[PDB]
Amino acid sequence: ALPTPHEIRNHLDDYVIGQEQAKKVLAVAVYNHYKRLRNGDTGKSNILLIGPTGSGKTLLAETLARLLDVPFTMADATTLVGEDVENIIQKLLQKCDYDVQKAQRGIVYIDQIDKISRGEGVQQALLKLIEGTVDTSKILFICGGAFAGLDKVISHRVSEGELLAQVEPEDLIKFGLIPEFIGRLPVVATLNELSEEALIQILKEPKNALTKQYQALFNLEGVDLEFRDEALDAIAKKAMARKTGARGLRSIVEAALLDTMYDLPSMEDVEKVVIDESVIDGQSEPLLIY
Amino acid sequence: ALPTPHEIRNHLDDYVIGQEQAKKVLAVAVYNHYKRLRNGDTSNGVELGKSNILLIGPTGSGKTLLAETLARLLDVPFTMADDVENIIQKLLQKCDYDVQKAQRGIVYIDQIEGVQQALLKLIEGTDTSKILFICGGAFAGLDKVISHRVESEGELLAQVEPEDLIKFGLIPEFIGRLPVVATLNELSEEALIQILKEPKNALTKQYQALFNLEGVDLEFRDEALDAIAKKAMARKTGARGLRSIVEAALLDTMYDLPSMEDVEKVVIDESVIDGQSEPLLIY
Amino acid sequence: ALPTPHEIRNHLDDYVIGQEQAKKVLAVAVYNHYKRLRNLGKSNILLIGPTGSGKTLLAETLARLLDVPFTMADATTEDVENIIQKLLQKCDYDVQKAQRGIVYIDQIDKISALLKLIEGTLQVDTSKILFICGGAFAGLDKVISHRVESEGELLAQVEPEDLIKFGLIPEFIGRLPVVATLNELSEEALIQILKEPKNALTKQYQALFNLEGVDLEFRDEALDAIAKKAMARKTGARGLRSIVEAALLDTMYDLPSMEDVEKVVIDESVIDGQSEPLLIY
Amino acid sequence: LPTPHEIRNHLDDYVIGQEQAKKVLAVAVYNHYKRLRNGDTSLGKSNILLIGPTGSGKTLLAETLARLLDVPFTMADATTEDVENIIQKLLQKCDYDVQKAQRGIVYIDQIDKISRKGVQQALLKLIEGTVDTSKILFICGGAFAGLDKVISHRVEASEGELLAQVEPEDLIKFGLIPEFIGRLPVVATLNELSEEALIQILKEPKNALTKQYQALFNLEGVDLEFRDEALDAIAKKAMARKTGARGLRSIVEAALLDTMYDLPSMEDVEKVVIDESVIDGQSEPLLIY
Amino acid sequence: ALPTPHEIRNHLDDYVIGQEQAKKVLAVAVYNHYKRLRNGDTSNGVELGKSNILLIGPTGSGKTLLAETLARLLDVPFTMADATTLVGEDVENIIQKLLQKCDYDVQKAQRGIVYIDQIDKISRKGVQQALLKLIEGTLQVDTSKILFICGGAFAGLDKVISHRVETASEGELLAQVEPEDLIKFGLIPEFIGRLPVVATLNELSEEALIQILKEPKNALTKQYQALFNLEGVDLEFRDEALDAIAKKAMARKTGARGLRSIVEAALLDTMYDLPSMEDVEKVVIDESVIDGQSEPLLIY
Amino acid sequence: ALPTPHEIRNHLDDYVIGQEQAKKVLAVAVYNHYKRLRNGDTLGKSNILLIGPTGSGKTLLAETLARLLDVPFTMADATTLVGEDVENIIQKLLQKCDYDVQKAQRGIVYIDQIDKISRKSGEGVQQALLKLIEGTLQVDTSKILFICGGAFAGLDKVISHRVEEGELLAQVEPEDLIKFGLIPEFIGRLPVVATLNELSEEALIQILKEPKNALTKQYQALFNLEGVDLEFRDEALDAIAKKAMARKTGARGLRSIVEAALLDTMYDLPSMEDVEKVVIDESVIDGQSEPLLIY
Ligand SMILES: Nc1ncnc2c1ncn2[C@@H]1O[C@H](COP(=O)(O)OP(=O)(O)OP(O)(O)=S)[C@@H](O)[C@H]1O
Ligand SMILES: Nc1ncnc2c1ncn2[C@@H]1O[C@H](COP(=O)(O)OP(=O)(O)OP(O)(O)=S)[C@@H](O)[C@H]1O
Ligand SMILES: Nc1ncnc2c1ncn2[C@@H]1O[C@H](COP(=O)(O)OP(=O)(O)OP(O)(O)=S)[C@@H](O)[C@H]1O
Ligand SMILES: Nc1ncnc2c1ncn2[C@@H]1O[C@H](COP(=O)(O)OP(=O)(O)OP(O)(O)=S)[C@@H](O)[C@H]1O
């Protein structure tokens, strides 16, 4: 039984924060794609994700795959080679037990599509798959990307989110994509820039959140790691100022706990408390409790 | 067995709307091209002239679509272009590297001095003599030069002459290679409405089928279709910007559709233009 | 008795007219050539005019007016002496009369060996025969402009150095002292272009229709009508195909769907364009 | 498991300087084996990326870390079905023990060389894990020449001050793919050059200078012997000129020039190269008949 | 018997006007070349250096004329060639042509002269290296023996030399010419070293041009007087008209190559309706040339 | 039997004057190259990079080494460089080698003006020619010896900005060539680096006299078959030397001076009857005074 776009967006709220509009657009696009497949046809319903780095694009594509127990595989548009284009396919079969049908129900995420925008040979080569020649007609294609200059071209025609909403196929044309490639991506879902509160929730809520990991790394040391809310907010701010999105959270946390993890096993105390001054300033050492 | 110019123009009506004249011209020229290849370059002691095509129409008129359609209709290898020999190898990529079938192919050049002469060597052939070349282009200033000689845009583009293209910016040795000149006309408001309804793959039909497998009947009131037309003209996106309007109009409805139980959903003009009013729902 | 340049240009007006000034240069060039043989510059000729200006027709007419063996040759196509043997073929293999012959070389501007002939070396010598080298010279209109600082006024300022920068070598241009530039072509010469050539428009379409099982017939009135239509648009012969195609469009569109003997193109089909071609079953 | 202190302390006995990278390595290494000994969780990959000039001691550090933890070690060149060859070689020096081979360390040299600016994705399959390669620690070394430039075009002192401002995006623009960099969370950067490392360069490699010349002399019927003092001299000379490992041949050649000129015109058993020959350059290499 | 360089330059004065210095350089270059061939490549244990020539002068200066003249004066097989038409198998085509005008005699073909026009055109600023294979020497004939004269205007050469000598007129600057200047121009060192002898020509003058229209046995005036002569009409060129023609040629910078283009255009009308008249003679005045409006005087 | 580096440097003294240090380097470099091939390897490529001013004798050295080892030699200009044109150098090596695969693998290949392709298409050539240097007709380019001349103008500077002309070129380092415009993978293929010096007045003078084919000997012979004895006073030869140095044309700019000095003299020589012509410094430096004629 296929989950309604409601059940899909609902389950997406359990992994990705915000981007509600992008999760509605994806839910509908996904439901329509598998609803069209389970009825043997009689639109390709392929997807183009347009959002900043660390917005949750790749996470969304992987989540959709799990929620539908469907074989999923990634790929970078930078590593693209015509015989390497089918390599993505064999990888989908590898994680599909080499089942032709279940592999046709699969989802394929292509990262950094905005990077190959003239390169044009890759667009046309990968274009052969999107259409279909196992047949690649059945599988869903999700093309992520940051599209930097895109925010400019759209403005030259019409916040960053309000501008990305007025996105048009002609805008992607001027950006560097070819017509025949854009016509294969009818569904365009745009994600907004993550705020601070979302980032803080990413550091806490998820079952694999950074804090939980380090609290577990410090836990097997016999030490209790405590992240004060001020410290988490500081990390969020530290990440935004670097525009690294949620991808630049670990690079902050590691740098903050570096010294402490170094001379931790050579100490004997109860717990270590990380304050905001430890993050922002980076000068002050973390609180130590014996 | 080659499809008569009638059969070709007929199948072209199933994907492209209007431009009936451009379709006759394309149908004839295409028929003569492949009728020429099967018989041979030389026929009865006389050498037959290659009839390459030059599409002259506004952006989003259907030039690229036409070229594509013609290729599919004739199950012939097709490839676009905007390194000159790179186009050929690509034609070979989609042709299974078959030399013969790749000579029967069609090559569309979009947005048509050194490049003119470099691409000219292909048009002639060195083989690239066999393949058909369709050169698209909007030719903005062309509407002016023609007016300064002959003394709507369609009536003027009909008076197009090889000399007009010369003054435009093309070289004589390149234009002589494009005997067939097909001109597409300005799309009308009524034309757009027909694009949403008439074609066998028109938008309304796609969605009426998407909603249909939901057990729901989707009904587009003519007002809504006219609204979609205007909305598309104000954005100058032509026919390319139609889907972006329909999707946006039916976004909310498709979201919580499989979560309801009703007979049909009706899209009024208020749902398109205003975008504030939700589509009528009938249980 | 050799015809004075007057008589030569006068007879040239029966086959070609228009811009003039080349029929004079050619008349002078030609007169001097045979006035020099029957008794000193080589007096070879270089025709520089748009396609369909009547360069080819001009060359042939000159041959007929002087009852002299004529033969053409494409600059695009041991093969160099092939032109000679052909000149002997139309000359009854008469060495002397073949030396008085005229040779026209088309599309010279495209090649920017043959030089060895122009000079002169079968046993016949190529020093005696007159060489007329035609060509459109597209980029030539530009190089002249970048120096002197209508296309006709520019082609009048033509200089051997302009042909050099164009793509012609000095030793080859020095062999062609006489340089004639023509624009437009006479109505008659146009009619002959649609007929005479081995690749004439009517022959092509007559062959195109021929493989349909249909016989295409062009009435002289139609050919005349195509000629005028071409002059009114100043497109010359380059604007001939754009008339024929437009005249035979409808016919070729629903031709493969018919079953009839032949199709006849009257003048009413061309000029008026309203009346449909005569159809015979 | 040895504390990062004990680890950094033992690293000081084989490599000089680069204390910061040695801390970064001690922590990342400790956290990697501390995470394996507890079977993850009933956790980051903790993989390492070494960014330092050639001859800085990257390779040396990787080997030392392996010996200090009595863990199976194996190298590999990013320049050279062959991806799993490194694994079988790791099992070769591990007595084919699956478990002990999983706790092993793998050093990949010249990663900056494969930066497209397929191998990255192929090797990426291992970093993730499919014996499973998930358990083993990966240390990816490299000089990253153009890296010093891209960081400067973003941050806007010494190369060391710029390599400290290194960011994942800088590597992206350099030529590395996102999915590959995300696998190397730990980035340690070396500054100055290592002396003992250089000496190992002149000896250890299968194509080392001394080995090449000893052979050149060998086909002369002469045994070339390099005294460790001379090799040390050559290392120092290379550091003073900041030429690194690239400026070693230019030193050896210059040191063996006169010898090779009038060697074929002599008849003796072997030539010995002392430190006096190299540093002073005044004394001629000892000759034995 | 070989003509002393003097006899060579003297005979060069009968076909070329001015350019005395370059004629001197050629005379010596030519004399030594054949004086070298007859004696043999090697002379008295020492190997004599091949002295090929590089002519550097404006267009229509007389470069081609000098090369041809030298060839006739020594009754030696001559052949031209353009550096623009240059193809490695086409480089030997020049040789087969030399054999064609030499009755396929190997030895006499080796004594031949080969003029290469527009060398300055092939300056990259391959062919230089391909043609360089001939200059050195490798049908079975060897190209070592044949003398090579490489012509060329070298437009930009007048500039580079100025940017060097500075640390007068074009003539004074071309005199300061140096192999390194040709290097910077666009010629490869190995190619320039093959052209030791460098003769430069000066830009023609009015007085010279007028003598060009008169003195030579094939001067334009003599040709047209002959063309008019077989018409029964005597053509008279007034010195003023000849002067006018000179000036017209100078203003166009066409040199001596643009003289015929001036005479033809001046005598066009006259030659057109000449065979349709019956008079004694025609006299071309300056008014007929410069103004071009006035028709030539007609005498019955 | 391979000639010891001594014998090699010795025979190089008989064609090239000075450059002793470079000759030694080349002598070792060459001997090791053919000592390594003769034993079928088993080893460094032993490829050479000549760095000297124009007309110092780089090309001469390469040609002399070839002849001394009776080995097929061929040149090539880095300027004329096309990836399929690089193998043209090979077919040419086979042309002068009677198309013998083995002997063509023993050959020497000189590439002139390498300093010119330094990107400071150029880099593309370096990497293209680099494929040869490594080794891939059917002949392999791993066996043949590659010598790459070049003036390296700006090199004199970069070296100075580091060490802080001959004494500076001696301090040459592979990193200096890097900054110059050569890629690392290319320089690493040219381990041996011989540097030449700017020919001294005395060296130039010797060039005009000593060589069995010296200019003076040629002209003395050309004049000799005229029945005239040519005398070059040492002052004139030095005068010519200075003239060639001020122009920087190295030794390539010698003939261009002598021919110019003896122009007028050879013009009206066959038209005279005297014993001998004596060329004083005044004939060259002044250029104004005519040569001394003796009857
Ligand atoms: N909206 C979100 N809600 C919750 N977690 C998020 C969100 N966005 C990112 N993350 C987390 O932050 C990490 C960022 O990595 P990715 O999701 O791969 O970034 P990305 O934006 O998909 O990178 P791209 O688009 O391929 S350049 C992921 O592991 C997510 O778990
Ligand atoms: N006359 C028409 N009838 C039906 N659909 C059309 C028509 N014109 C355009 N379209 C559709 O709108 C889209 C516009 O893309 P194209 O057809 O490539 O436009 P185009 O005018 O060919 O663009 P150019 O000429 O390359 S700038 C196509 O995907 C067509 O499906
Ligand atoms: N110094 C001169 N004395 C007499 N007649 C000359 C002189 N220079 C040129 N002419 C004549 O003017 C004509 C000019 O043509 P050329 O001699 O071919 O010019 P050119 O300078 O040789 O052209 P190049 O060097 O090949 S670009 C020749 O036919 C000569 O007869
Ligand atoms: N050291 C030397 N001893 C004797 N003769 C020399 C010496 N150097 C140059 N020559 C002569 O002077 C001439 C100069 O030409 P080349 O040797 O080609 O100059 P080059 O320095 O090799 O030029 P490059 O390296 O290609 S820029 C040669 O013909 C040599 O015969």
Curated annotation (Swiss-Prot), chain D:
GO BP term, pick one: cell division
Cofactor note: Binds 1 Zn(2+) ion per subunit.
Molecular functions per Gene Ontology: ATP binding; ATP hydrolysis activity; ATP-dependent peptidase activity; ATP-dependent protein folding chaperone; disordered domain specific binding; identical protein binding; protease binding; protein dimerization activity
GO cellular component labels: cytosol; endopeptidase Clp complex; HslUV protease complex
TM regions (residue ranges): none
Superkingdom of the source species: Bacteria
Disulfide cysteine pairs (residue numbers): none
Keyword ATP-binding in annotation: yes
Cofactor needs: Zn(2+)
Keyword tags: ATP-binding, Chaperone, Host-virus interaction, Metal-binding, Nucleotide-binding, Stress response, Zinc
Annotated knockout phenotype: Delayed and decreased induction of the extracytoplasmic-stress response.
Effect of residue 246 to K: No ATP hydrolysis
Residues binding ATP, per UniProt: 53-60
Family, similarity comment: Belongs to the ClpX chaperone family.
Quaternary state and interactors: Component of the ClpX-ClpP complex. Forms a hexameric ring that, in the presence of ATP, binds to fourteen ClpP subunits assembled into a disk-like structure with a central cavity, resembling the structure of eukaryotic proteasomes. Interacts with Mu phage DDE-recombinase A; this interaction remodels the viral transpososome for replication.
Function: ATP-dependent specificity component of the Clp protease. Uses cycles of ATP binding and hydrolysis to unfold proteins and translocate them to the ClpP protease. It directs the protease to specific substrates both with and without the help of adapter proteins such as SspB. Participates in the final steps of RseA-sigma-E degradation, liberating sigma-E to induce the extracytoplasmic-stress response. It may bind to the lambda O substrate protein and present it to the ClpP protease in a form that can be recognized and readily hydrolyzed by ClpP.
Name of the protein: ATP-dependent Clp protease ATP-binding subunit ClpX
Organism of derivation: Escherichia coli (strain K12)
Residues of the full protein shown: 64 to 413 of 424
